[PDB]
């Protein structure tokens, strides 16, 4: 059971968020580690690209998301 990167990739084609197969599947983990649906994940993710000013997406910026925003509010590890 995953989150189907095909459901989260759609939100990446709307704002022009270029992400290869490896990058989109990286967010699929975020939907299984916290339970954030494809719609709420993309919504919270791009808010992280503003607090740090980063209009680009790699494996670092998407990684620091679980160590900055979601790290201080894990609902499955209390």
């Amino acid at each position: 059971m995953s989150a189907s990167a095909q459901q989260l990739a759609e939100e990446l084609q709307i704002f022009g968020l270029d992400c290869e197969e490896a990058l989109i599947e990286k967010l699929v983990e975020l939907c299984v580690q916290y339970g954030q649906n494809e719609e709420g994940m993309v919504g919270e993710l791009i808010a992280f690209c503003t607090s740090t000013h980063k209009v680009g997406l790699t494996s670092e910026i998407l990684n620091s998301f679980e160590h900055e925003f979601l790290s201080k509010r894990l609902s499955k590890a209390r």
């Binding site: 759609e10 939100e11 084609q13 709307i14 704002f15 022009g16 649906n37 719609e39 709420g40 993309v42 919504g43 791009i46 808010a47 503003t50």
Partner: protein
């Protein structure tokens, strides 16, 4: 002393008023004086201050006419007559060409000095609308041409999606973007003839929420929508000249115009699905909901469901080499106005708030 009919007919051909009582009231406002008319100074309706001085002479006598409804009646017939002709001479692409221009005419007024429309809000709608479906603008161009090409048994599109998603929001805007009317088939096949007679000389039809026997477990009420669609095979194909009736005596026997059929996850027969072209499953997105929760101007001023909104989306993304060669000169015009008011940063910044779930204009 005598009333002129050619003048009333002229005004009718101008505003393209295909209504009787409407054309009557509008013309009855020029039997006073444009000297102090508030509606003429305030610049409220282009169909008033732009034609009062032109028909003030006749309207003055029109008031003392014993056939006020008769004079305007003939005008209406002349209006429908025009459309009756254009639906045969002008190609399906030229018909749109005129529509796209009329849509811009409103813009040149609302987005001008005598307008109260804010371009910022309409540009925000283009953002929400593009966040409704993958490559929304791209799909619009395909549908447009799909309507132009007019391919038998390959015309209607399917807007099948759950409640509250954007179907009625897009299927509506598209109706105004291209032109036409929206019908319904939930009613018995009795008055169906009195309603299907609206697609006469039209461009496309819009079937809103068709009820079918399917989806009995999904709390989806059954009806005659899906059934009626199948009871209109030729109507969906368009390879034959179907029969239509307008006010008792038959008024037309042409090819039933293409269009869009919407529904809420109902069951669809294979013999029916084979009459469609593409199936767009609308997804009830949350970020879109929270978006409008801080963007009332889209629902209030009717932007997300306005044809003028999609037009701005067609001029923003799609190149000029895709429009008619007689309108390409006008497309570039707004490609300069829009890029002047909004750059690429302010634009995506709006689609950004959409992703968040906040006001598009934040």
């Amino acid at each position: 002393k005598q009333v002129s009919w050619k003048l009333v007919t002229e005004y009718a051909m101008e505003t393209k008023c295909d209504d009787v009582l409407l054309l009557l009231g509008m013309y009855l406002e020029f039997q006073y004086s444009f000297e102090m008319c508030l509606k003429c100074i305030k610049k409220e309706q282009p169909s008033h201050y732009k034609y009062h001085e032109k028909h003030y002479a006749n309207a003055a006598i029109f008031a003392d006419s014993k056939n006020q409804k008769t004079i305007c009646q003939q005008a209406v017939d002349t209006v429908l007559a025009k459309k009756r002709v254009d639906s045969l001479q002008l190609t399906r692409e030229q018909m749109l060409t005129n529509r796209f221009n009329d849509l811009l005419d409103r813009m040149d007024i609302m987005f001008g000095s005598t307008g109260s429309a804010d371009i910022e809000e309409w540009m925000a709608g283009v953002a929400w609308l593009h966040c409704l479906l993958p490559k929304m603008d791209s799909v619009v161009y395909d549908f447009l041409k799909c309507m132009v090409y007019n391919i038998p048994k390959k015309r209607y599109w399917l807007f099948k999606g759950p409640i509250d998603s954007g179907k009625t929001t897009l299927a509506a805007a598209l109706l105004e973007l291209c032109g036409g009317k929206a019908l319904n088939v939930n009613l018995p096949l009795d008055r169906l003839n009195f309603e299907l007679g609206v697609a006469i000389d039209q461009f496309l039809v819009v079937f809103e929420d068709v009820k079918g026997t399917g989806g009995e477990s999904r709390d989806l009420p059954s009806g005659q929508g899906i059934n009626n669609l199948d009871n209109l095979r030729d109507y969906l194909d368009g390879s034959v000249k179907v029969n239509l009736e307008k006010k008792h005596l038959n008024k037309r026997t042409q090819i039933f115009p293409p269009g869009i059929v919407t529904m809420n996850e109902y069951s669809v027969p294979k013999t029916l699905q084979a009459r469609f072209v593409k199936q767009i499953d609308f997804r009830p997105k949350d970020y879109l909901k929270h978006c409008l929760e801080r963007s009332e101007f889209l629902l209030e001023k009717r932007i997300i469901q306005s044809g003028i909104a999609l037009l701005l989306m067609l001029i923003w993304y799609r190149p000029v080499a895709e429009f008619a060669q007689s309108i390409q000169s006008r497309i570039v015009e707004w490609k300069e106005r829009l890029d002047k008011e909004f750059s690429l940063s302010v634009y995506q910044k709006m689609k950004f708030n959409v992703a968040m779930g906040i006001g598009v204009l934040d």
